[PDB]
Amino acid sequence: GMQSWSAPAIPVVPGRGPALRLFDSADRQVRPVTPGPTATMYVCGITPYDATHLGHAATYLTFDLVHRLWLDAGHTVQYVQNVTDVDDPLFERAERDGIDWRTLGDRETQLFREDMAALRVLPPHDYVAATDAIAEVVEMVEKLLASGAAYIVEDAEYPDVYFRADATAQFGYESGYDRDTMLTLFAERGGDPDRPGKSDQLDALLWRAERPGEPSWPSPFGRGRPGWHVECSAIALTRIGTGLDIQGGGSDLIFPHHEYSAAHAESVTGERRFARHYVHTGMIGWDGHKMSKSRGNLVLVSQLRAQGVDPSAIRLGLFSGHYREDRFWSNEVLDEANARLARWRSATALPEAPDATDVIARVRQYLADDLDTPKALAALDGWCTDALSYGGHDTESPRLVATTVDALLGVDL
Ligand SMILES: N[C@@H](CS)C(=O)NS(=O)(=O)c1cccc(-c2cccs2)c1
Ligand SMILES: [Ca+2]
Ligand SMILES: [Zn+2]
């Protein structure tokens, strides 16, 4: 659909380690990721404003690990990401910034492209803009109208189409929150608990009808725009199908977003489980709020690259913590990545070093354990201390360690 970014080289490392075990946010426990021969991943993409902040980075870098660890095990991978190129935050940024919303999003998607290519994240295989996915969303919203799972609000001028929360008996399994806590998040994450004519406070917009002053598209439900959640479950369903191994994104999406996407797809395919694994991750600004230009807490990787930070240092930086930990960027973390990058690059430049077959198996093992990069970086800190301090005799373990750090981690040594 849309052009993504370019793929870095992917060396193949001989051998295999343990199969991936990931934490599933839904079941609140670590279960094995058992994929098919074609392994499938959908990660919620960007809303094209605020370039690539470290929250975006931390997120797509984490699924890079899954992407890469899957490839090393021998799986072929179908990775679909999306762009929310029409969205209410986007319009608010456009109107404040005195710039057109489409011109904004196109330039911001371009900035994301370059930051991902700079960070050596493997591209998705289908890159789908939300505006390029109206037909799929209409075709879906038709099917939930037919099953009564959706309805049209009693508003002839603004005939919004809404999704019944109880359209599905298992609604709430992924998020796990009670109704009181679900309500108060809905209002803080771009939803309408006060919209008149609604059957349930927690029903989610499926098709927002034409408002004056707003872009829109024709449909059997009137003219207007799609809703957020149905966008992603539509693209996910049509490009992959009922057997989705991983659904991932930033942490805010545990609810509403991912809860409702699953609810939509399950209500139309009859499936009980939309995704075998729900995976969430994220960075926060210095203030404990999500990063945004509005808050004055935005750090762009573009600004770090300008500050002269190696893109690999950004990887080691963010990987120094576990992905379900409370990651925070700082000059402290930047220096540990810079020292760690220096230390690793000198060991891999040695003429001969001790055998590495072991430390490769320890790294393959730590990553398969819910992506345990803290313990995987330390095993490499140790193979480096032994090599620099004491030396070895494999004239091949330098290059082998370099190229396995590249394949599995994306770090360029
Ligand atoms: N377009 C939607 C998804 S359909 C969206 O959420 N877009 S986004 O640009 O807000 C975004 C994307 C990826 C990660 C994060 C964050 C992770 C942790 C903190 S923020 C934020
Ligand atoms: Ca659950
Ligand atoms: Zn999404």
CSV table of C-alpha atoms and ligand atoms in Angstrom, one decimal:
chain,number,residue,atom,x,y,z
A,1,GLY,CA,0.0,0.0,0.0
A,2,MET,CA,2.1,2.9,1.3
A,3,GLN,CA,5.9,2.8,0.9
A,4,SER,CA,7.6,1.8,4.2
A,5,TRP,CA,11.3,2.0,4.8
A,6,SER,CA,14.3,0.1,3.5
A,7,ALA,CA,15.5,-3.1,5.2
A,8,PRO,CA,19.0,-3.4,6.7
A,9,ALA,CA,21.1,-6.5,5.9
A,10,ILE,CA,20.1,-9.5,8.0
A,11,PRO,CA,22.9,-12.0,8.4
A,12,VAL,CA,21.9,-15.6,9.2
A,13,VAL,CA,23.4,-17.1,12.3
A,14,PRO,CA,24.0,-20.8,12.4
A,15,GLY,CA,22.0,-22.6,15.1
A,16,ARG,CA,18.8,-22.0,17.0
A,17,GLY,CA,17.9,-21.2,20.6
A,18,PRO,CA,14.7,-21.6,22.6
A,19,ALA,CA,11.4,-20.6,21.1
A,20,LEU,CA,10.0,-17.2,22.1
A,21,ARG,CA,8.1,-17.0,25.3
A,22,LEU,CA,6.4,-13.6,25.6
A,23,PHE,CA,4.2,-11.9,28.2
A,24,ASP,CA,0.6,-11.7,27.1
A,25,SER,CA,-1.1,-8.6,28.6
A,26,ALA,CA,-4.5,-10.2,28.4
A,27,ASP,CA,-3.8,-13.4,30.4
A,28,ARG,CA,-1.4,-11.3,32.6
A,29,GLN,CA,1.3,-14.1,32.4
A,30,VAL,CA,4.2,-15.3,30.3
A,31,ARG,CA,3.1,-17.9,27.7
A,32,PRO,CA,5.0,-19.4,24.8
A,33,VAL,CA,4.5,-17.7,21.4
A,34,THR,CA,3.8,-20.7,19.2
A,35,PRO,CA,3.3,-19.4,15.7
A,36,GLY,CA,2.5,-21.1,12.4
A,37,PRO,CA,5.1,-21.5,9.6
A,38,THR,CA,4.1,-18.0,8.5
A,39,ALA,CA,4.2,-16.0,11.8
A,40,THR,CA,2.0,-13.0,12.0
A,41,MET,CA,2.4,-9.6,13.8
A,42,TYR,CA,0.3,-6.4,13.8
A,43,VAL,CA,1.8,-3.5,15.6
A,44,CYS,CA,-0.3,-0.3,16.0
A,45,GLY,CA,1.5,2.4,14.0
A,46,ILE,CA,2.0,6.1,14.5
A,47,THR,CA,-0.3,9.1,14.4
A,48,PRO,CA,1.8,11.3,12.1
A,49,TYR,CA,2.6,14.2,14.5
A,50,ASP,CA,5.7,14.5,16.9
A,51,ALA,CA,8.1,12.6,14.5
A,52,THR,CA,9.7,9.7,16.2
A,53,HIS,CA,9.8,10.3,19.9
A,54,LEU,CA,11.5,7.8,22.2
A,55,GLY,CA,8.1,6.3,23.0
A,56,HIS,CA,7.6,5.4,19.4
A,57,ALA,CA,11.2,4.2,19.2
A,58,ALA,CA,11.1,2.1,22.3
A,59,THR,CA,8.0,0.5,20.8
A,60,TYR,CA,9.0,-0.4,17.3
A,61,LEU,CA,12.5,-1.4,18.5
A,62,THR,CA,10.9,-3.9,20.9
A,63,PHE,CA,8.9,-5.5,18.1
A,64,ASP,CA,12.1,-5.4,16.1
A,65,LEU,CA,13.5,-7.9,18.6
A,66,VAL,CA,10.5,-10.2,18.0
A,67,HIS,CA,10.8,-9.7,14.3
A,68,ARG,CA,14.5,-10.6,14.4
A,69,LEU,CA,14.3,-13.4,17.0
A,70,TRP,CA,11.5,-14.9,14.8
A,71,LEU,CA,13.7,-14.8,11.7
A,72,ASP,CA,16.6,-16.5,13.5
A,73,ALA,CA,14.4,-19.4,14.5
A,74,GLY,CA,13.5,-19.9,10.8
A,75,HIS,CA,10.1,-18.4,10.6
A,76,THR,CA,8.8,-16.4,7.6
A,77,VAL,CA,7.3,-13.2,9.0
A,78,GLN,CA,4.2,-11.1,8.0
A,79,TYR,CA,4.5,-7.8,9.9
A,80,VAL,CA,1.7,-5.3,9.2
A,81,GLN,CA,1.8,-1.7,10.6
A,82,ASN,CA,-0.6,1.2,10.0
A,83,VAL,CA,-0.7,4.9,9.9
A,84,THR,CA,-3.5,6.8,11.6
A,85,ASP,CA,-3.3,9.6,9.0
A,86,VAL,CA,-6.7,11.0,10.0
A,87,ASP,CA,-7.5,11.4,13.6
A,88,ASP,CA,-8.7,14.1,16.1
A,89,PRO,CA,-5.3,14.8,17.8
A,90,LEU,CA,-3.9,15.2,14.3
A,91,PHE,CA,-6.5,17.9,13.4
A,92,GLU,CA,-5.8,19.7,16.7
A,93,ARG,CA,-2.1,19.8,15.9
A,94,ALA,CA,-2.8,21.0,12.4
A,95,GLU,CA,-5.1,23.8,13.5
A,96,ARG,CA,-2.8,25.0,16.3
A,97,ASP,CA,0.4,24.8,14.2
A,98,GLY,CA,-1.3,26.7,11.4
A,99,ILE,CA,-0.5,23.9,8.9
A,100,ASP,CA,-2.7,21.6,6.8
A,101,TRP,CA,-3.4,18.2,8.3
A,102,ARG,CA,-2.5,16.1,5.2
A,103,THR,CA,0.7,18.1,4.5
A,104,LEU,CA,1.5,17.6,8.2
A,105,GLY,CA,1.0,13.8,8.2
A,106,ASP,CA,2.8,13.2,5.0
A,107,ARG,CA,5.9,15.1,6.2
A,108,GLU,CA,5.7,13.3,9.5
A,109,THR,CA,5.3,9.8,8.0
A,110,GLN,CA,8.4,10.7,6.0
A,111,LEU,CA,10.3,11.6,9.2
A,112,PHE,CA,9.2,8.3,10.8
A,113,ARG,CA,10.4,6.5,7.7
A,114,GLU,CA,13.9,8.0,8.0
A,115,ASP,CA,14.2,7.4,11.7
A,116,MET,CA,13.2,3.8,11.3
A,117,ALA,CA,15.7,3.3,8.5
A,118,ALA,CA,18.3,5.1,10.7
A,119,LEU,CA,17.5,2.8,13.6
A,120,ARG,CA,17.7,-0.3,11.4
A,121,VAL,CA,14.2,-1.5,12.2
A,122,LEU,CA,13.0,-4.0,9.6
A,123,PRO,CA,10.1,-2.6,7.6
A,124,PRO,CA,6.6,-4.1,7.7
A,125,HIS,CA,5.5,-6.0,4.7
A,126,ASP,CA,2.2,-4.1,4.3
A,127,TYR,CA,2.2,-0.5,5.3
A,128,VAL,CA,-1.4,0.7,5.3
A,129,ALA,CA,-2.7,4.2,5.7
A,130,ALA,CA,-6.1,4.6,7.4
A,131,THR,CA,-7.4,6.6,4.5
A,132,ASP,CA,-6.4,3.8,2.1
A,133,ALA,CA,-8.6,1.5,4.2
A,134,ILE,CA,-12.1,3.0,4.0
A,135,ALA,CA,-13.5,0.1,2.0
A,136,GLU,CA,-12.3,-2.5,4.5
A,137,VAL,CA,-13.8,-0.5,7.4
A,138,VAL,CA,-17.1,0.0,5.6
A,139,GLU,CA,-17.2,-3.7,4.6
A,140,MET,CA,-16.6,-4.5,8.3
A,141,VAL,CA,-19.1,-2.0,9.7
A,142,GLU,CA,-21.7,-3.4,7.4
A,143,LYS,CA,-21.2,-6.8,8.9
A,144,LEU,CA,-21.7,-5.6,12.5
A,145,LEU,CA,-24.8,-3.6,11.4
A,146,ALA,CA,-26.2,-6.8,10.0
A,147,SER,CA,-25.6,-8.8,13.2
A,148,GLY,CA,-27.1,-6.0,15.3
A,149,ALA,CA,-23.7,-5.7,17.0
A,150,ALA,CA,-23.7,-2.1,15.8
A,151,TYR,CA,-26.4,0.6,15.6
A,152,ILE,CA,-26.9,4.1,14.3
A,153,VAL,CA,-27.3,6.8,17.0
A,154,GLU,CA,-30.7,8.6,17.1
A,155,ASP,CA,-29.3,11.7,15.4
A,156,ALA,CA,-30.5,12.3,11.8
A,157,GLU,CA,-28.0,15.1,11.3
A,158,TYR,CA,-25.0,13.3,12.8
A,159,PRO,CA,-25.9,9.6,12.3
A,160,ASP,CA,-22.9,8.1,14.0
A,161,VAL,CA,-22.6,4.4,13.9
A,162,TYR,CA,-21.6,2.8,17.2
A,163,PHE,CA,-20.4,-0.6,18.4
A,164,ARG,CA,-22.3,-2.2,21.3
A,165,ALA,CA,-19.8,-3.1,24.1
A,166,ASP,CA,-21.8,-6.2,25.0
A,167,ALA,CA,-21.7,-7.4,21.4
A,168,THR,CA,-19.4,-10.0,22.7
A,169,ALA,CA,-19.6,-12.1,25.8
A,170,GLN,CA,-15.8,-12.0,26.4
A,171,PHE,CA,-15.5,-8.3,26.2
A,172,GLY,CA,-12.9,-7.1,28.7
A,173,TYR,CA,-10.8,-10.3,28.7
A,174,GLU,CA,-7.7,-8.5,27.3
A,175,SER,CA,-7.7,-5.3,29.4
A,176,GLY,CA,-9.0,-7.0,32.6
A,177,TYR,CA,-10.2,-3.7,34.2
A,178,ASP,CA,-13.6,-3.4,35.9
A,179,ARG,CA,-16.2,-1.1,34.4
A,180,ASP,CA,-15.6,1.9,36.7
A,181,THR,CA,-11.9,2.0,35.7
A,182,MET,CA,-12.8,1.4,32.0
A,183,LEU,CA,-15.1,4.4,32.0
A,184,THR,CA,-12.6,6.9,33.3
A,185,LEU,CA,-9.9,5.8,30.8
A,186,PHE,CA,-12.4,6.1,27.9
A,187,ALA,CA,-12.7,9.9,28.5
A,188,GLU,CA,-9.0,10.4,28.9
A,189,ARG,CA,-8.1,8.4,25.7
A,190,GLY,CA,-10.3,10.1,23.1
A,191,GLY,CA,-13.9,8.8,23.5
A,192,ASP,CA,-17.4,10.1,24.1
A,193,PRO,CA,-18.9,9.1,27.5
A,194,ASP,CA,-21.4,12.0,27.2
A,195,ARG,CA,-22.5,11.7,23.6
A,196,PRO,CA,-26.3,11.8,23.6
A,197,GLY,CA,-28.4,9.0,22.1
A,198,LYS,CA,-25.9,6.3,23.0
A,199,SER,CA,-27.2,3.0,24.3
A,200,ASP,CA,-24.1,2.4,26.5
A,201,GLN,CA,-21.6,4.9,27.8
A,202,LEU,CA,-18.8,2.7,26.7
A,203,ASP,CA,-19.9,2.0,23.1
A,204,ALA,CA,-17.2,2.9,20.6
A,205,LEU,CA,-17.5,5.1,17.5
A,206,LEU,CA,-17.5,3.0,14.3
A,207,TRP,CA,-18.3,5.7,11.7
A,208,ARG,CA,-18.3,9.4,12.7
A,209,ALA,CA,-20.7,11.2,10.4
A,210,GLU,CA,-19.9,14.3,8.4
A,211,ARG,CA,-19.4,17.3,10.6
A,212,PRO,CA,-19.1,20.7,8.9
A,213,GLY,CA,-15.5,21.7,8.6
A,214,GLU,CA,-14.3,18.1,8.5
A,215,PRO,CA,-12.9,15.7,5.8
A,216,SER,CA,-15.2,12.8,5.0
A,217,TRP,CA,-15.9,9.9,2.6
A,218,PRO,CA,-19.1,8.4,1.2
A,219,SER,CA,-20.6,5.3,2.8
A,220,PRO,CA,-24.0,3.5,3.1
A,221,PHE,CA,-24.1,5.0,6.6
A,222,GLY,CA,-23.8,8.6,5.4
A,223,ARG,CA,-20.7,10.6,4.8
A,224,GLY,CA,-18.0,10.8,7.5
A,225,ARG,CA,-14.8,9.2,8.9
A,226,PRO,CA,-14.0,5.8,10.4
A,227,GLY,CA,-13.5,5.3,14.1
A,228,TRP,CA,-10.1,4.6,15.6
A,229,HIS,CA,-10.4,1.0,16.8
A,230,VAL,CA,-12.2,-0.4,13.8
A,231,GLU,CA,-9.5,1.0,11.6
A,232,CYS,CA,-6.9,-1.3,13.1
A,233,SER,CA,-9.0,-4.4,13.5
A,234,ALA,CA,-10.1,-4.0,9.9
A,235,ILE,CA,-6.6,-3.7,8.4
A,236,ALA,CA,-5.4,-6.5,10.8
A,237,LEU,CA,-8.3,-8.9,9.7
A,238,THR,CA,-8.1,-8.3,6.0
A,239,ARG,CA,-4.3,-8.4,5.6
A,240,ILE,CA,-3.7,-11.3,8.0
A,241,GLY,CA,-6.9,-13.2,9.0
A,242,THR,CA,-8.2,-15.0,12.0
A,243,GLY,CA,-4.8,-16.4,13.1
A,244,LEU,CA,-3.0,-13.4,14.4
A,245,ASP,CA,0.0,-14.4,16.6
A,246,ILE,CA,0.9,-11.0,18.1
A,247,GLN,CA,-1.0,-7.7,18.5
A,248,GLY,CA,1.3,-5.0,19.9
A,249,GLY,CA,1.6,-1.3,20.6
A,250,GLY,CA,2.2,1.4,23.2
A,251,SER,CA,0.9,0.8,26.7
A,252,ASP,CA,-2.1,3.2,26.5
A,253,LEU,CA,-3.7,0.8,24.0
A,254,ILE,CA,-4.3,-2.0,26.5
A,255,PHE,CA,-7.7,-0.2,26.7
A,256,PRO,CA,-9.6,1.2,25.0
A,257,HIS,CA,-7.9,0.6,21.8
A,258,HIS,CA,-6.9,-3.1,21.7
A,259,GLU,CA,-9.9,-4.3,23.8
A,260,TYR,CA,-12.3,-2.8,21.2
A,261,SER,CA,-10.3,-4.0,18.1
A,262,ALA,CA,-10.5,-7.6,19.4
A,263,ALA,CA,-14.2,-7.1,20.2
A,264,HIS,CA,-14.9,-6.0,16.6
A,265,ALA,CA,-13.0,-8.9,15.0
A,266,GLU,CA,-14.3,-11.5,17.3
A,267,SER,CA,-17.9,-10.3,16.7
A,268,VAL,CA,-17.5,-10.7,13.0
A,269,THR,CA,-15.4,-13.9,12.7
A,270,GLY,CA,-17.0,-15.8,15.6
A,271,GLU,CA,-13.6,-16.3,17.0
A,272,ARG,CA,-13.2,-16.2,20.8
A,273,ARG,CA,-9.6,-14.9,20.7
A,274,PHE,CA,-8.5,-12.2,18.1
A,275,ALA,CA,-4.8,-12.4,19.0
A,276,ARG,CA,-2.9,-15.2,20.8
A,277,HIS,CA,-0.7,-12.6,22.4
A,278,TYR,CA,-1.3,-8.9,23.4
A,279,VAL,CA,2.0,-7.1,23.9
A,280,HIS,CA,2.4,-3.5,25.3
A,281,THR,CA,5.5,-1.3,25.8
A,282,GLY,CA,6.4,2.3,26.2
A,283,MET,CA,8.6,5.2,27.2
A,284,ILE,CA,7.5,8.2,29.2
A,285,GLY,CA,8.8,11.8,29.3
A,286,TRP,CA,10.7,13.4,32.1
A,287,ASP,CA,7.3,14.3,33.7
A,288,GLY,CA,5.6,10.9,33.9
A,289,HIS,CA,3.2,11.9,31.1
A,290,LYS,CA,3.2,10.6,27.5
A,291,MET,CA,5.6,12.5,25.3
A,292,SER,CA,4.0,15.3,23.2
A,293,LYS,CA,4.9,18.7,21.9
A,294,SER,CA,2.0,20.1,24.0
A,295,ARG,CA,3.7,19.1,27.2
A,296,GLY,CA,7.2,20.4,26.4
A,297,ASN,CA,8.6,16.9,27.1
A,298,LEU,CA,9.4,15.7,23.6
A,299,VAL,CA,12.7,14.1,22.8
A,300,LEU,CA,13.0,13.1,19.1
A,301,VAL,CA,15.6,10.5,18.0
A,302,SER,CA,16.1,13.1,15.2
A,303,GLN,CA,17.3,15.5,18.0
A,304,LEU,CA,19.5,12.7,19.5
A,305,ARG,CA,21.0,12.0,16.1
A,306,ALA,CA,21.7,15.7,15.8
A,307,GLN,CA,23.2,15.7,19.3
A,308,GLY,CA,25.5,13.2,17.7
A,309,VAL,CA,24.2,9.9,19.2
A,310,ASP,CA,24.9,6.8,17.2
A,311,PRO,CA,21.6,5.1,16.3
A,312,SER,CA,23.0,1.9,17.9
A,313,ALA,CA,23.5,3.8,21.1
A,314,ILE,CA,19.8,4.5,21.1
A,315,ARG,CA,19.1,0.8,20.8
A,316,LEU,CA,21.5,-0.1,23.6
A,317,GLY,CA,20.1,2.8,25.6
A,318,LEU,CA,16.5,1.7,25.4
A,319,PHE,CA,17.4,-2.0,25.7
A,320,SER,CA,19.2,-1.4,29.0
A,321,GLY,CA,15.8,-1.8,30.7
A,322,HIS,CA,13.3,-4.6,30.3
A,323,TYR,CA,10.4,-3.7,28.0
A,324,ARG,CA,7.8,-4.1,30.7
A,325,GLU,CA,9.9,-1.8,33.0
A,326,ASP,CA,9.5,1.9,33.4
A,327,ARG,CA,12.1,3.1,30.8
A,328,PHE,CA,13.4,6.6,31.0
A,329,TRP,CA,16.0,8.3,28.8
A,330,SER,CA,18.8,10.3,30.5
A,331,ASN,CA,22.4,11.4,30.1
A,332,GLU,CA,23.0,8.5,32.5
A,333,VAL,CA,21.5,5.9,30.2
A,334,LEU,CA,23.1,7.6,27.1
A,335,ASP,CA,26.6,7.2,28.6
A,336,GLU,CA,26.1,3.6,29.6
A,337,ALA,CA,25.1,2.9,26.0
A,338,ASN,CA,28.1,4.9,24.7
A,339,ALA,CA,30.5,3.1,27.0
A,340,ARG,CA,28.9,-0.3,26.3
A,341,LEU,CA,29.0,0.5,22.5
A,342,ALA,CA,32.7,1.4,22.8
A,343,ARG,CA,33.5,-1.7,24.8
A,344,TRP,CA,31.7,-4.1,22.4
A,345,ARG,CA,33.2,-2.6,19.3
A,346,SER,CA,36.8,-3.1,20.5
A,347,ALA,CA,36.3,-6.8,21.4
A,348,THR,CA,34.8,-7.4,18.0
A,349,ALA,CA,37.8,-5.7,16.4
A,350,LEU,CA,40.2,-8.2,18.1
A,351,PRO,CA,42.3,-10.6,16.0
A,352,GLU,CA,41.4,-13.5,18.3
A,353,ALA,CA,39.1,-14.1,21.3
A,354,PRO,CA,37.7,-17.0,23.3
A,355,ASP,CA,35.1,-19.3,21.9
A,356,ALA,CA,31.7,-17.6,21.6
A,357,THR,CA,29.3,-20.5,20.8
A,358,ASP,CA,28.3,-20.4,24.5
A,359,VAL,CA,27.6,-16.6,24.8
A,360,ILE,CA,25.6,-16.8,21.7
A,361,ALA,CA,23.4,-19.5,23.3
A,362,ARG,CA,23.1,-17.4,26.4
A,363,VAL,CA,22.0,-14.4,24.4
A,364,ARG,CA,19.5,-16.5,22.4
A,365,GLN,CA,18.2,-17.9,25.7
A,366,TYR,CA,17.8,-14.5,27.5
A,367,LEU,CA,15.9,-12.9,24.5
A,368,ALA,CA,13.5,-15.9,24.3
A,369,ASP,CA,12.7,-15.2,28.0
A,370,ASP,CA,10.2,-12.4,27.5
A,371,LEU,CA,12.8,-10.3,25.8
A,372,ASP,CA,15.3,-10.1,28.7
A,373,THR,CA,17.8,-7.6,27.2
A,374,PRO,CA,19.2,-6.5,30.6
A,375,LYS,CA,20.5,-10.0,31.2
A,376,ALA,CA,21.5,-10.4,27.5
A,377,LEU,CA,23.5,-7.2,27.5
A,378,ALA,CA,25.4,-8.3,30.6
A,379,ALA,CA,26.4,-11.7,29.0
A,380,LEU,CA,28.0,-9.6,26.3
A,381,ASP,CA,29.6,-7.3,28.8
A,382,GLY,CA,31.2,-10.4,30.2
A,383,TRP,CA,32.4,-12.0,27.0
A,384,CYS,CA,34.0,-8.6,26.3
A,385,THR,CA,35.8,-8.3,29.7
A,386,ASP,CA,37.3,-11.8,29.3
A,387,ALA,CA,38.4,-11.0,25.7
A,388,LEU,CA,40.0,-7.6,26.3
A,389,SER,CA,41.5,-8.4,29.7
A,390,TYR,CA,42.7,-11.9,29.0
A,391,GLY,CA,42.4,-12.7,25.2
A,392,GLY,CA,41.7,-15.9,23.3
A,393,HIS,CA,42.5,-17.9,20.2
A,394,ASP,CA,39.5,-18.1,17.9
A,395,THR,CA,40.3,-15.9,14.9
A,396,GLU,CA,36.6,-16.2,14.0
A,397,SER,CA,34.7,-15.4,17.3
A,398,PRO,CA,35.2,-11.6,16.8
A,399,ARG,CA,33.3,-11.5,13.5
A,400,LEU,CA,30.8,-14.1,14.7
A,401,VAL,CA,29.9,-12.1,17.8
A,402,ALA,CA,29.7,-8.9,15.7
A,403,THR,CA,27.3,-10.4,13.2
A,404,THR,CA,25.1,-12.1,15.8
A,405,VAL,CA,24.7,-8.8,17.6
A,406,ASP,CA,23.7,-7.3,14.2
A,407,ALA,CA,21.1,-10.0,13.4
A,408,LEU,CA,19.5,-10.4,16.8
A,409,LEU,CA,19.8,-6.9,18.2
A,410,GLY,CA,20.1,-4.5,15.2
A,411,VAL,CA,23.2,-3.0,16.8
A,412,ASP,CA,26.0,-2.3,14.2
A,413,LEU,CA,29.4,-3.3,15.5
B,1,LIG,N1,-2.0,5.7,15.9
B,1,LIG,C1,-2.1,5.1,17.2
B,1,LIG,C2,-2.1,3.6,17.2
B,1,LIG,S1,-3.4,2.9,16.1
B,1,LIG,C3,-1.1,5.7,18.2
B,1,LIG,O1,-1.2,5.4,19.4
B,1,LIG,N2,-0.2,6.6,17.7
B,1,LIG,S2,0.9,7.3,18.6
B,1,LIG,O2,1.7,8.1,17.7
B,1,LIG,O3,0.2,8.0,19.7
B,1,LIG,C4,1.9,6.0,19.3
B,1,LIG,C5,2.4,5.0,18.5
B,1,LIG,C6,3.2,4.0,19.0
B,1,LIG,C7,3.7,4.1,20.3
B,1,LIG,C8,3.2,5.1,21.1
B,1,LIG,C9,3.6,5.2,22.6
B,1,LIG,C10,4.2,4.2,23.3
B,1,LIG,C11,4.4,4.5,24.7
B,1,LIG,C12,4.0,5.8,24.9
B,1,LIG,S3,3.3,6.5,23.6
B,1,LIG,C13,2.4,6.1,20.6
B,2,CA,CA,-7.6,-11.6,30.8
B,3,ZN,ZN,-4.0,0.7,16.4
